[PDB]
Amino acid sequence: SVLASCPKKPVSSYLRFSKEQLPIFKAQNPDAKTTELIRRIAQRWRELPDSKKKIYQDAYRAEWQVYKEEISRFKEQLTPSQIMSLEKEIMDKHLKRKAMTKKKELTLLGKPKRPRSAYNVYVAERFQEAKGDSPQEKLKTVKENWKNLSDSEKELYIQHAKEDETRYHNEMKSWEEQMIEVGRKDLLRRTIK
Amino acid sequence: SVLASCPKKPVSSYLRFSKEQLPIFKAQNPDAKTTELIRRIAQRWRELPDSKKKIYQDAYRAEWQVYKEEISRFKEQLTPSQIMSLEKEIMDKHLKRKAMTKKKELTLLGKPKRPRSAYNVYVAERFQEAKGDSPQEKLKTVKENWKNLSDSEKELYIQHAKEDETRYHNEMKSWEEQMIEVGRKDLLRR
DNA sequence: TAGCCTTTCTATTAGCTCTTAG
DNA sequence: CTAAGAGCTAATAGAAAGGCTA
DNA sequence: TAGCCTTTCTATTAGCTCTTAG
DNA sequence: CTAAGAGCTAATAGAAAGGCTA
């Protein structure tokens, strides 16, 4: 909202060169992978005489002066409420990226899944059965069927949950022992129940 | 600040008991550490019959109903801009506490100071020799007498700024390798 | 992976005093 | 949706010098 | 320790494409 | 300013089950 309209900074000298060069490298080798092309483009950059790098550097510097003007005139026409909104939007985006980065990191470190309750075991064992033309409606259905379960049957899912609590404690003790060894004592629970 | 005026949540039963008891314990033991009074207060709570703990829980539950009412009519009267401000204030507070906790932790772990710049070394030695009514107004004198400095005079301080850059690299490889010992690779640069 | 739907759980964190020290 | 990968440039945040008041 | 003042530095992270896969 | 310490209670955030579309 405020962030959407905020002037964006110009790209540096090399990234400018990189974006005219990529489509020509791609058009000549449409099968070769983008990581190989960028790897091939970087050196066209290293090899490029400094008289030619200066053409890209001069454009960057000239656009940097447009940016300074654009951003100064932008920030100074914002109301206090729009300044707060811009700061909250930037903060929220940064936190979304940090949270997402941490989840990918913990998956690479092989963090155990948390205990799956009897309802979670139910949703796994009997979801695609549930009538629904949308995954959200197949779940909406699962919630009613879960309630309609006989007491006899729900105790079957409670024991599956019970034995998964044991799996959680075992795997966590093992994973947390491994994190101290990898030097990630920070990833440990402070309150281990 | 929207958060300043926001109804706060009631304290749980033990903290209600703890409140009335601390003055009594303090008055009876005035040379005792607050940490020891709270330890003895928790002991009284543990010993307290559940019929008496329920008196404090019933008050909590009754105050929880007052809270729900107060917070809903407070938030209903907030403009969209005040709702966004309240949410930003809550998050900023949480992050200020996280950042502050990390700085205290790194000070206990004895993290090396970063490299002092030539300006930094000029402020340290020539600060109290500068005219100024307030510490901010003393720094303006040093900032003005830094700008005016000769290149040869700058080199005298630039002598410390280069030997301190060595001190930083040395102390950091020592501290970072010690942080691997304690199992805190997360605190390294990388 | 996030977010949609509901339900359910674990781990975290909020609250309070009063002194010390960051 | 968007981070990762494959590169480079450089703006950015925050720490650092001092001390006094939150 | 944060934040006030200015200046200065180090470490981080932003930018770009296009495909893959989280 | 406020975290730490010395305790307890419980609200809260976010993960978990599934799959499909950002």
Residue numbers in the entry:
A (entry chain A): 44 to 236
B (entry chain B): 44 to 233
Question: Paper's wording?
Answer:
Mitochondrial transcription factor A (TFAM) plays a critical role in mitochondrial transcription initiation and mitochondrial DNA (mtDNA) packaging. Both functions require DNA binding, but in one case TFAM must recognize a specific promoter sequence, while packaging requires coating of mtDNA by association with non sequence-specific regions. TFAM is composed of two tandem high-mobility group (HMG) domains connected by an α-helix linker. In this study, we identified two TFAM residues, Ser61 in HMG box1 and Pro178 in HMG box2, that form specific hydrogen bonds with N2 of two guanine bases separated by 10 nucleotides (GN10G consensus).
In order to further investigate whether the GN10G consensus could drive TFAM binding to DNA, we decided to crystallize TFAM in complex with a 22-mer nonspecific sequence (NS2) containing a single GN10G consensus where all other nucleotides were randomized with respect to the sequence used for our LSP structure. Strikingly, the TFAM-NS2 structure showed a unique arrangement. All TFAM-DNA structures determined to date have revealed that a molecule of TFAM interacts with a molecule of DNA (1:1 ratio of TFAM to DNA) (19,20,30,35). However, in the TFAM-NS2 structure, the binding site of TFAM was composed of two halves of adjacent DNA molecules. HMG box 1 of a TFAM molecule interacts with half of a DNA molecule, while HMG box 2 binds to a different DNA molecule (see scheme on Figure 5B). Intriguingly, the TFAM-NS2 structure was also bound a GN10G consensus, although in this case the consensus was formed between two adjacent DNA molecules. Since nothing in our experimental setup prevented TFAM from binding a single DNA molecule, under our experimental conditions DNA bridging appears to be preferred, although the reason for this preference is unclear. A similar structure has also been observed for Abf2p, the yeast TFAM homolog, indicating that the ability to bridge DNA ends is common to both proteins. Importantly, Abf2p plays no role in transcriptional initiation, perhaps suggesting that this ability might be relevant to the role of these proteins in mtDNA packaging.
